[PDB]
Design a protein around this ligand. Structure first.
Ligand SMILES: [Cl-]
Ligand SMILES: [Cl-]
Ligand SMILES: [Cl-]
Ligand SMILES: [Cl-]
Ligand SMILES: [Cl-]
Ligand SMILES: [Cl-]
Ligand SMILES: [Cl-]
Ligand SMILES: [Cl-]
Ligand SMILES: [Cl-]
Ligand SMILES: [Cl-]
Ligand SMILES: [Cl-]
Ligand SMILES: [Cl-]
Ligand SMILES: [Cl-]
Ligand SMILES: [Cl-]
Ligand SMILES: [Cl-]
Ligand SMILES: [Cl-]
Ligand SMILES: [Cl-]
Ligand SMILES: [Cl-]
Ligand SMILES: [Mg+2]
Ligand SMILES: [Mg+2]
Ligand SMILES: [Mg+2]
Ligand SMILES: [Mg+2]
Ligand SMILES: [Mg+2]
Ligand SMILES: [Mg+2]
Ligand SMILES: [Mg+2]
Ligand SMILES: [Mg+2]
Ligand SMILES: [Mg+2]
Ligand SMILES: [Mg+2]
Ligand SMILES: [Mg+2]
Ligand SMILES: [Mg+2]
Ligand SMILES: [Mg+2]
Ligand SMILES: [Mg+2]
Ligand SMILES: [Mg+2]
Ligand SMILES: [Mg+2]
Ligand SMILES: [Mg+2]
Ligand SMILES: [Mg+2]
Ligand SMILES: [Mg+2]
Ligand SMILES: [Mg+2]
Ligand SMILES: [Mg+2]
Ligand SMILES: [Mg+2]
Ligand SMILES: [Mg+2]
Ligand SMILES: [Mg+2]
Ligand SMILES: [Mg+2]
Ligand SMILES: [Mg+2]
Ligand SMILES: [Mg+2]
Ligand SMILES: [Mg+2]
Ligand SMILES: [Mg+2]
Ligand SMILES: [Mg+2]
Ligand SMILES: [Mg+2]
Ligand SMILES: [Mg+2]
Ligand SMILES: [Mg+2]
Ligand SMILES: [Mg+2]
Lengths: 174, 174, 174, 174
C-alpha cells in the first residue's frame, strides 16, 4: 500500500471514487440545464447562469474528492460520466424540481458514505464530509425548495409572466 | 426549425455536438493526469497543475461549443463522457506523449469540421474554428512537443533527477 | 483603374455598394421603429432607445463599407435610401419580428457577398466579412430571437402588462 | 472536581496528558533533526529550517492540549520529555523517513484518543480532534510522503547532487 495510508479502508476508498463520479454526473446535468435555458426558444439567461454556476460548483466538489483520495493514499479510479436523464428540461419549475431531486440524491450518497466511514471508524473521513459537504448540501436543497415554492406561487408552468419575473428577481442578474 | 437558424446544416449541427463531447473527453483525460501527478508516489506538483489547467481549458472550449450551437439555432445533444484510456500515466514523458496525441486528435477533429463547414458553405462556422480554435491548438501542440524534446534531453524515463528538474523549471511554479 | 487596386473584381465592388445601401436601409428602418416607440400613444422608451442604438450601429456598418471600398480602390456609388416598409410597427412583438426578418435579410446579403468573394478568389474581402460582420450578425439575430421568445412568454400582443415589463427588464434602461 | 467539569471522563483527561507529552516528544525529535542539518559536515540549511518549523508546530500543538485540559477542568500532569531515538539522522532521506514514522505515530495516538472520546460519549473532545488535529496530520503525512518520493527520484542516499537540489527546490528558502 501507499506509504501515507493509515486507517483508510478499501471500501471507503472505493466509495470515494463513486462519490467523485456522482459529482461529475451532477455537474454534467447542471451543464445541460444551462444549455437548455440558453436556447433561443427558452431564453431565461439568469436561470441559465444559475445552473452554470452550479455545474462549476459540482466539478469543484469532484476535484476535492480527487485531492482527498490522494491525501489518504487511495487511488483515483475514473468511470464514464453518464449523460443527463433528459435532453430538454421543460421550464424553470420542471428544471428546479429535477435539481431538487438531484441534490437529494447527492445528499443521500454523502450520508451513506458517512455511515460507511462510521462503520470503518474513520473520523477523518467523517469530519471531511461533515465540514465540507453536508452543510452546503442542506443549504442548496433549502434554496431550491424556496425557488420551487416561489415558482408555484408565480403560476408555473402556465404563467409565462411569472416565469419571466422569476428570472429577473429570484436569481442573480448575470 | 429555430427562428434564428440560417445557413446551418444539420450535419454541421451534429458535428458540433460531437466536437463538444470530444472536448469534454479531453478535459477528463487531463483531469486524470492531474490526479496521477498529485499521487504521493508520483508527487510532481507543477506537472499536475499544468494538466489541471489544461483540463479547465478544454472544459471552457466545450462550453464555447454549447454557446455556439445555441447561437446558430442548433440543439445541444449530450452523450456520455468516456473515461480516459489509462488509469495511470507512467511518468512525465509518457503523459506528455499522450497529451501530444490527444491534442493532435482534437486538432484533426477541428480540421475535419472545417472541411465539413467548407463543403456546406458555412463561413461563420469556418471563421469560428479559424479564429477561436485552430491557432490555439497549434500553439498547444508546439508547447507539448517542446516539452517532450526537453524531457528526452533530461534523460527520461530513467533519469529521475531530470524529471525533478523539469517540474521545477519547465512548467509554471504552482 | 486606381493605383491601389489589386485582386478586386468589378462584381465585388458593385456588391459592396449594394451592401452599403442595404445597411443604410436597415438603419432607416430602425430609426422608424425608434420614432414609433417614442410616440405619446406608444411610449415604450427603453424599446425606442434599443432601436435608436441599432439604427446607429447600422449606419456605422455602412460607413465601414465606404471605407472598405476606398481602401481597395473601388468607387463608392450611392443610391436612394428607400423608406421603411411600414409607417407604424404595431407593438413590441411585431417590431421585433420585423427586426428579426431584417437582420436575416442583411445576413443573407452578407453570406451572398462572401460567396461572390469566394468565387472571385478575394480572401481579403472574405476575411473582412468573416471578422467584421458575420459574427456580430449572428449575435444580433440570437438576441432578437431571445426577445421574441420572451415577448410571447409575456403574453404579447394582448398582455399590456407584459409589454410594460419587457421595456423595464429586457432592454437597457435609458 | 473542578467547578467547570462536565462530561469529561478521567480516562480522557489522562489520555490528553499523554498526548501532550507525545507532542513535546515529537517537537524535540524535530529539534534534533534541525541541529543535525545545521552541522558543518551536513549543511543543508533549508532542510534544517523545515525541521525547525515542524518543531515549533508540535510545541504549539502541545500548548493547545494544555489549554484544552484546563478548559475542560482537567489537570495538566507533565512527565519527562524523552530524548530522540537517534543522535544523528544520516541524510535527508533517512530523516524524512523518520519524520513520516513519527507523524504516523502521532496520528495513531490521535485516532486512539478519538476512539476513547467516542467510547466515553464526549463529542466536544471528538470535534476538537477532528477539527484541530486530524486534517493537519493527514496533510503533513502527505507532504512528507511526497518528499520521500522525490528524494528517491533524486537518487538518495547516493546522489549528493540530488540531495543538494532537494534543499534548494523542495523546501522553502530560509
Ligand atoms: Cl490503511
Ligand atoms: Cl482495507
Ligand atoms: Cl428529454
Ligand atoms: Cl469544523
Ligand atoms: Cl417587476
Ligand atoms: Cl426591479
Ligand atoms: Cl438553416
Ligand atoms: Cl440541413
Ligand atoms: Cl492503465
Ligand atoms: Cl537547478
Ligand atoms: Cl532556480
Ligand atoms: Cl484588380
Ligand atoms: Cl474586374
Ligand atoms: Cl404602415
Ligand atoms: Cl480574426
Ligand atoms: Cl465530568
Ligand atoms: Cl470520570
Ligand atoms: Cl544515533
Ligand atoms: Mg512505496
Ligand atoms: Mg481496494
Ligand atoms: Mg446510457
Ligand atoms: Mg462524529
Ligand atoms: Mg461548518
Ligand atoms: Mg453549495
Ligand atoms: Mg449541491
Ligand atoms: Mg453539494
Ligand atoms: Mg418557433
Ligand atoms: Mg439534424
Ligand atoms: Mg468504456
Ligand atoms: Mg474554398
Ligand atoms: Mg479571422
Ligand atoms: Mg487570430
Ligand atoms: Mg490552448
Ligand atoms: Mg488543447
Ligand atoms: Mg485546443
Ligand atoms: Mg492614377
Ligand atoms: Mg465595375
Ligand atoms: Mg417607394
Ligand atoms: Mg478567416
Ligand atoms: Mg472574431
Ligand atoms: Mg451587432
Ligand atoms: Mg444587425
Ligand atoms: Mg449586423
Ligand atoms: Mg471548587
Ligand atoms: Mg483521573
Ligand atoms: Mg532514555
Ligand atoms: Mg458513533
Ligand atoms: Mg467540524
Ligand atoms: Mg476543517
Ligand atoms: Mg501541520
Ligand atoms: Mg505533524
Ligand atoms: Mg500534527
Amino acid at each position: 500500500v501507499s506509504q501515507v495510508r493509515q486507517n483508510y479502508h478499501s471500501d471507503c476508498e472505493a466509495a470515494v471514487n463513486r462519490m467523485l463520479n456522482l459529482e461529475l454526473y451532477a455537474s454534467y446535468t447542471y451543464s445541460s440545464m444551462y444549455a437548455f435555458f440558453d436556447r433561443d426558444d427558452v431564453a431565461l439567461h439568469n436561470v441559465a447562469e444559475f445552473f452554470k454556476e452550479h455545474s462549476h460548483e459540482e466539478r469543484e466538489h469532484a476535484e476535492k474528492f480527487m485531492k482527498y483520495q490522494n491525501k489518504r493514499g487511495g487511488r483515483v479510479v475514473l468511470q464514464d460520466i453518464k449523460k443527463p436523464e433528459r435532453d430538454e428540461w421543460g421550464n424553470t419549475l420542471e428544471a428546479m424540481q429535477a435539481a431538487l431531486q438531484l441534490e437529494k440524491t447527492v445528499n443521500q450518497a454523502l450520508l451513506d458514505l458517512h455511515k460507511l466511514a462510521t462503520d470503518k471508524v474513520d473520523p477523518h473521513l467523517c469530519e471531511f464530509l461533515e465540514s465540507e459537504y453536508l452543510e452546503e448540501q442542506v443549504k442548496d436543497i433549502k434554496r431550491i425548495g424556496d425557488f420551487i415554492t416561489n415558482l408555484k406561487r408565480l403560476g408555473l408552468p402556465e404563467n409565462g409572466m411569472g416565469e419571466y419575473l422569476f428570472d429577473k428577481h429570484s436569481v442573480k442578474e448575470s
